[PDB]
Structure formats: structure tokens, C-alpha cells
Design a protein around this ligand. Structure first.
Ligand SMILES: *[C@@H]1O[C@H](CO)[C@@H](O[C@@H]2O[C@H](CO)[C@@H](O)[C@H](O)[C@H]2NC(C)=O)[C@H](O)[C@H]1NC(C)=O
Ligand SMILES: *[C@@H]1O[C@H](CO)[C@@H](O[C@@H]2O[C@H](CO)[C@@H](O)[C@H](O)[C@H]2NC(C)=O)[C@H](O)[C@H]1NC(C)=O
Ligand SMILES: NC(=O)c1ccc[n+]([C@@H]2O[C@H](COP(=O)(O)O)[C@@H](O)[C@H]2O)c1
Ligand SMILES: NC(=O)c1ccc[n+]([C@@H]2O[C@H](COP(=O)(O)O)[C@@H](O)[C@H]2O)c1
Lengths: 250, 250
């Protein structure tokens, strides 16, 4: 297996994050049984590390699903850490990692051992080793649910300094989220193309892969919009480059 | 009891945070037993809610204690959430909430019932109800240790928009941290007096209570410096006021 091995103390982390997230839910949706949510999740750990399907996590989703506030959904590609810091524990936006079912697994890794019943802490299959691995199937199911329950203004953060372009045509965003957006519940889609401070400007709005994305969205009938270096996020990037010209204050 | 009751699922949260913090420790001190640390914590917990002293957490500290990087300590008053966001989970600085023994209790609340042996989820005493309550004794003990283990350049974030002044002469910093700083391993102390965007300039470096802080540190023999609205933190504050003139970019 060519991917990271199972996260140590997976269960405690999972249960801990689930318990803390509950406090964020409103009393009306605060009724979530974390132990049951974990039991539904661990079903993938009883299977062959190459035989886990997205549907296997259906129960898990049913037990953790909760609504997402309108205009608060934030999708992304190649900017995991920046999205989490910007979203700031749901205060600014609510990306998948800030939704219950995404929160419990964010950055974690897991899979059962090939021939044994125990968890494999050595490594886990990548999409290259096999398509139906536990992690990939998990995110496909979770991202599908996140897209379906999103509404209002849809925000997307992309990396304009990524060597392969801002929009990867084969990513989760392209294959599992865009196709599941409910047009009737969406006002418009707003893209944020962020560049590293001083970093390379590989692609900006309307260039390269960004043209492919815009064309797909408009063809699908969505009202579209793109912003290079959305100021609020730029300010956050600047926290680490305060003495750089890009970050000088008036 | 005037303070909020013990946090729900206190144990799951505690162990969850503990498990996650380990990954952040260098292999050298990563040898931590979260369950044992929890048991040490309970020792102070299973006592009369108005009879818990700082020393009751000695064991807890011993099992969770670890070194703090030179020049990475960050003390503060009246800016808890801003300090946590700036510190960014130990990436920039390591405030008390980003040290193992502080991380597991951050924002939480706890106390045993006045009579029965169960935790009191209804309420917990404040300093007013009784001085020796579980939470205040915990933070006194933790502050003392954090302070004794800090070295190099000491940083302090103060809120210059606080009505009563930037430096509380009766807060944890003045009463439990400054007295426990080891001058032998400290090079200098640097203060950052932060003001709310647009917010009031109640006090700035060299004014009011700040004059008290400076004189106390200098009387103790420390090299001292103060900075108004330290740029990196100012930028972070700006993320939420991108269109305010204080936040306009060059
Ligand atoms: C946006 O993409 C850039 C380019 O891939 C990322 O920066 C690279 O990060 C890797 C790993 O941290 C380094 O090995 C490279 O040296 C970096 N390259 C450059 C040009 O900076 C950057 O981390 C991405 N931004 C976000 C928020 O994920
Ligand atoms: C710095 O102190 C100020 C003053 O106490 C804090 O601002 C107040 O925050 C409360 C609670 O959110 C508001 O109801 C008041 O309207 C604010 N007053 C003013 C004058 O702004 C501020 O939150 C503190 N800063 C930090 C980072 O904690
Ligand atoms: N840890 C996560 O939060 C996580 C992981 C994989 C996919 N996703 C979803 O897929 C999209 C792209 O993420 P990838 O980096 O996996 O391509 C995002 O918009 C997100 O909602 C989120
Ligand atoms: N949750 C916390 O991180 C926490 C709580 C109480 C005291 N403290 C320590 O005491 C000092 C003053 O802050 P407080 O006003 O919260 O007591 C800080 O420098 C800090 O290190 C930290």
C-alpha cells in the first residue's frame, strides 16, 4: 500500500471530535449519538481494504447528517489548511471538514489489514493500489452529501499557484460535488483563486483550467463569478508574510 | 454556583484532544499515556468542589509535562480566541492552550457535585462562590508550570481596548506567571498591545496599567520592549474587516 497508515488512536480522536462538534450544533439538531456514529463508521474497518464502497457509509451519514446554513458552503481544491484556518471552526464558513461527518475524519487515515482483522497502521491503499479503498470511498460519500445539502451562494477556494492548474478535472470537486449541486437551491457560484504570497501565479481567473471550469458551470446554467486573491483570505495568508510588499498596509 | 456546569462528554473530549496533541510532540517526549493523564486529572476532580487546590493537579502535570520551544512562549490577557487563532495549533507560537496540559482543558468546565459523587452538569463555583474550585485551581497550577518552562524571548499579547486597561494587576499573568518566570533562561520580554479594528484605544504602550507592567518587569531586571498592534496579529484581526481603512492594503 502506497498511502499513509491508519491514524493512531483513531477511535479516541473520532469520538473526541464528534463530542466537541455537537456543542456547535443547535439544540434542535444536537441529538447525535457519537458512539453509534462511530459504530456505523467502523463497518469499513471490517472489510477488505480494497472492497469498501461509498454506499457502505450510508448508515454513518444517516446518523451524522445535519443541515448546512445557506450561503455558508465552501468547496475547494489544493488548499486544505487554508480553508480550515479561514473557515475558523464554522465561524466564517462551513466547509465539509466543518460539518459533522467531515469533521470526524478530517486529515485522518484508516483501513483494515489485508489478511487480518486488525487495523493496518503500516499503510493503506491509494486510488492507484485499488479504487475501492476506505478513505476514498468515505470522501466520495461525504462530498456527495455535502453538495446535495448546500444552497444559496456557493463558494469555492482554488490554488492559483498549483503546478497542475487551479482546477483538477479528476478531483472530488469535479467528479463528486459539481454533479450533485441542486441548481434549484443555488443562487450563484463564486470562485476564489488564491496565489501564494510572492508565490507563483500559475493560473488566474479565466486562464487554463479555470476556463474549463467556468465553461462547465455556465453550460450547466449556473450564475458564475471568479475573484483572484479574495482579500479576506489574502489577509490571512499575510499573517505569515507581514514584511512582504504584497502584505504592506496603507 | 454561578459558573457553567461541567462540559458534556468531558472524558471523550479530554482523551480526544490528548490523542491528537501527541502527534504534535517530538518522538522523544511523545511517550504519553492519555488514559493515565485522565486518571491523574480525576484525582482533583473527585474531591469536594470547594476543596481543590493547585497542588492536587501535581500528578496531572507530571504525566503531561513536556518542554516548550525556546522563544515560542506566548502569554496573554483578554484575547483568548485571538491568541488561539494566531498560535495556529503550535505553528507560530505555543501558548498554554497549545501545550498538552493546557490543550486538554481549554474552554472546558468541570466540578463534582456538592454532595453526590457524580459530576455537576448543572453548574460549577466561580471565584466568588469559593476560591478553591476545580477550574481555577487547575489553571493556577498549569500557569505556574507553563511559566517555569518558558525561555528565550517571552511574548505577551494584551488587549489595549479593554475598558479597565491592558494589564490587569489581578489576573493570572500578574499573579501566577510573572512571578514564576526564570530570568536565568530568559533573554527579554516583548509585549504586543492590540486594539480592536476601529475599536477604542483605551491604552497603548507606555500608558496607564502598561506603565505598571513595564516598571514591574524592569524592577525585576528584565529587558523590556512593547509594540502597538503587532503587524502579524493586526493582519489576522483584519481578515474580518477587509474593507476597513485600518485594513486597506498598499
Ligand atoms: C498552493 O500550491 C502551492 C504549490 O503546490 C503549495 O506550495 C508548495 O507546498 C509544498 C508543500 O508544502 C512545497 O513542497 C512547495 O515548495 C510549495 N511550492 C510553492 C511554490 O510554494 C501551497 O502550499 C498551496 N497552498 C495551499 C493553501 O495549500
Ligand atoms: C478586547 O476587549 C474588548 C473590550 O472588552 C472586546 O470587545 C468587546 O467584546 C464584547 C464581546 O464580544 C462585545 O459585546 C463588545 O461590543 C466589545 N466592545 C468593544 C469596545 O469592542 C474584544 O473582544 C477583546 N478582543 C479580543 C481579541 O478578545
Ligand atoms: N478532509 C477533507 O475535508 C476532505 C477530503 C477529501 C475531499 N474533500 C471534498 O472534496 C473537494 C476536493 O478535495 P480533494 O483535496 O480531496 O481533491 C472539497 O470541496 C471537499 O469538500 C474534503
Ligand atoms: N484557557 C487558557 O488557555 C487559560 C485559562 C486561564 C489562564 N491561562 C493563563 O493565564 C494568563 C491570563 O489569562 P486569563 O485571563 O484567562 O486568566 C495567560 O497568559 C495564560 O497562559 C490560560
Amino acid at each position: 500500500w502506497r498511502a499513509e497508515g491508519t491514524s493512531a488512536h483513531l477511535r479516541d480522536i473520532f469520538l473526541g471530535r464528534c463530542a466537541e462538534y455537537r456543542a456547535l450544533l443547535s439544540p434542535e439538531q444536537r441529538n447525535k449519538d457519537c458512539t453509534a456514529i462511530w459504530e456505523a463508521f467502523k463497518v469499513a474497518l471490517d472489510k477488505d481494504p480494497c472492497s469498501v464502497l461509498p454506499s457502505d457509509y450510508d448508515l454513518f451519514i444517516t446518523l451524522s447528517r445535519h443541515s448546512i446554513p445557506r450561503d455558508k458552503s465552501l468547496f475547494w481544491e489544493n488548499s486544505h489548511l487554508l480553508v480550515n484556518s479561514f473557515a475558523d471552526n464554522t465561524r466564517r464558513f462551513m466547509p465539509l471538514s466543518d460539518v459533522l461527518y467531515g469533521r470526524v475524519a478530517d486529515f485522518l487515515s484508516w483501513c483494515r489489514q489485508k489478511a487480518d482483522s486488525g487495523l493496518d497502521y503500516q499503510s493503506c491503499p491509494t486510488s492507484e493500489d485499488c479504487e475501492n479503498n476506505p478513505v476514498d470511498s468515505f470522501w466520495k460519500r461525504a462530498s456527495i452529501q455535502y453538495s446535495k445539502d448546500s444552497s444559496g451562494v456557493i463558494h469555492v477556494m482554488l490554488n492559483g499557484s498549483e503546478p497542475t492548474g487551479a482546477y483538477p478535472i479528476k478531483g472530488f470537486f469535479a467528479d463528486y460535488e459539481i454533479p450533485n449541486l441542486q441548481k434549484e437551491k443555488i443562487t450563484r457560484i463564486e470562485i476564489w483563486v488564491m496565489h501564494e504570497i510572492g508565490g507563483p501565479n500559475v493560473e488566474s481567473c479565466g486562464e487554463g483550467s479555470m476556463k474549463v471550469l467556468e465553461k462547465r458551470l455556465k453550460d450547466m446554467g449556473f450564475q458564475y463569478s471568479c475573484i483572484n486573491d479574495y482579500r479576506p483570505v489574502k489577509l490571512l495568508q499575510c499573517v505569515d508574510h507581514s514584511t512582504h510588499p504584497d502584505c504592506a498596509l496603507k
